[PDB]
């Protein structure tokens, strides 16, 4: 069966997806369904329709919880999430890594903060201004991810970690912490969340020597769990499936 | 190194027009934003307006909107200041800008005193 | 138009003495972005600007580390460890999160000798 001919028969669910999305995240999956349309191989759409799955549900996952969605060649590195929020540290932190210099760069899915205080604004910027993914409180949205793995499967499908620093209650609404989160769509997995684990304890502990308090998450979805069960919401996951998972399983079909 | 060189009409007559231009050395100003502020003994530091050269799009201060026009051209490695309609209140250092998403380099400065 | 307003006007220092400048704006700095556009400049006499802080707490290249910005949402203070003789000039404030970018009218730092 002809891709252009199975993208004009699922066009409909497509279009659906696309109004459900962050407008970014709609706008980079509008191009994925538009190249999977013409690709030339079974090969190259299938690639791109990997892209689409796992970036249609970044797109979600950041819905749900109020984030916003961050494309992939502007999120932000670990030396800028250092040098812009800690500046005074990012001198130190240069030292840490300097036998580990591929700690510089490792990028969360999802590099937020908590806001802080102690239009007609400026709208056009010459260079990328390094993103500030804000959030009201990263306990409380600790707190929502603790509770769903014990009921009130889930405590199977991520790993919550907080590197042990100490933040007062005036030291949490004074400073910048840092909840770094990771997302999958992924088949395998409990390989999103012991993957990421080995770099993460690790990065945890640096974060700490270097007097930041840092917050982590990993989770995944796959395919066979229940609907009222993936980490967005279920009206959300009648999407995805009748979406990207369909456009997989006619990809495993043809090829 | 960064450098910005400003140069232009050093005098001339109420009424008239003057360009200034701004030379950048040391980097291509394709790749950032230029500015032109405007500086008095006590009118002080007056910013004018930007120009992004790779689309060619300017933001000016609206009490500045008619008397300014920031023009540039990429291949010389240039922008261009055109106040018309002078008078004295345009009798003023003025810089050019390096826009980094924040202005960190300024030039030399071009002097104008406007009178017959 | 962000009102930029720098106190003192004069600030005579004896060198290697602290220095303490003020800068306080019309409304919030804050960028919806997250960023905070508030900069130091230092105008020598019959100099051009030098960029010392960019986004109230970056030094700027070059910049020595006796130099140190401070401050959030409308109030920011810079502050000038160990006050040098080179050190002269007019020091300006600047926000660059609003148009139209505005200045401060000045702080004179002299030195007392």
């Known amino acids: 069966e002809p891709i252009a001919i199975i993208c004009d028969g699922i066009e409909g669910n497509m279009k659906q997806l696309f109004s459900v999305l962050p407008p970014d995240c709609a706008r980079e999956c509008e191009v994925l369904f538009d190249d999977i349309r013409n690709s030339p191989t079974h090969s190259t759409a299938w690639k791109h329709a990997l892209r689409l799955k796992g970036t249609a549900y970044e797109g979600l996952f950041a819905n749900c919880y109020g984030w916003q969605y961050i494309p992939e060649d502007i999120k932000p590195s670990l030396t800028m999430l250092i040098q812009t929020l800690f500046p005074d540290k990012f001198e130190d932190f240069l030292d840490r890594t300097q036998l580990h210099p591929e700690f510089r760069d490792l990028t969360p899915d999802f590099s937020l903060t908590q806001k802080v205080h102690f239009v007609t604004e400026r709208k056009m910027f010459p260079l990328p201004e390094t993103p500030l993914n804000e959030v009201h409180s990263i306990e409380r949205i600790m707190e929502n991810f603790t509770r769903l793995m014990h009921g009130g499967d889930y405590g199977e499908r991520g790993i919550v970690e907080g590197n042990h620093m100490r933040f007062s209650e005036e030291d949490q609404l004074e400073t910048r912490q840092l909840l770094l989160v990771e997302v999958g769509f992924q088949t395998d997995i409990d390989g999103k969340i012991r993957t990421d684990h080995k770099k993460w304890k690790d990065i945890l502990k640096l974060l700490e020597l270097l007097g930041i308090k840092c917050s982590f998450v990993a989770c995944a979805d796959c395919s066979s769990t229940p609907p009222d069960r993936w980490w967005i919401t279920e009206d959300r996951v009648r999407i995805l499936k009748n979406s990207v998972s369909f456009l997989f399983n006619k990809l495993s079909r043809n090829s | 190194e960064v450098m910005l060189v400003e140069s232009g009409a050093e005098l001339v007559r109420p009424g008239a027009l003057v360009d200034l231009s701004c030379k950048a050395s040391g980097f291509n100003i394709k790749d950032y934003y230029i500015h032109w502020v405007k500086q008095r003994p006590e009118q002080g530091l007056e910013w004018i307006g930007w120009?992004?050269?790779?689309?060619?799009?300017?933001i000016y201060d609206p009490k500045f909107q008619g008397k300014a026009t920031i023009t540039a051209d990429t291949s010389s490695n240039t922008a261009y200041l055109r106040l018309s309609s002078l008078t004295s209140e345009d009798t003023a250092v003025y810089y050019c800008?390096?826009?980094?998403?924040?202005?960190?380099?300024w030039g030399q400065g071009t002097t104008l005193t406007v009178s017959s | 138009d962000i009102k930029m307003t720098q106190s003192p006007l004069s600030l005579p220092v004896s060198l290697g003495d602290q220095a303490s400048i003020s800068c306080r704006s019309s409304?919030?700095?804050?960028?919806?972005?997250?960023?905070?556009?508030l900069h130091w400049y230092l105008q020598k006499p019959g100099q051009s600007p030098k960029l010392l802080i960019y986004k109230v707490s970056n030094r700027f290249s070059g910049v020595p580390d006796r130099f140190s910005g401070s401050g959030s949402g409308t109030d920011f203070t810079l502050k000038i460890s160990r006050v040098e003789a080179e050190d002269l000039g007019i020091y300006f404030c600047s926000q660059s999160t609003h148009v139209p970018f505005t200045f401060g009218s000045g702080t004179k730092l002299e030195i007392k000798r």
């Open positions: 120009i992004d050269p790779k689309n060619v799009n300017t």
């Open positions: 800008v390096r826009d980094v998403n924040y202005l960190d380099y």
């Open positions: 409304q919030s700095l804050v960028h919806s972005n997250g960023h905070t556009y």
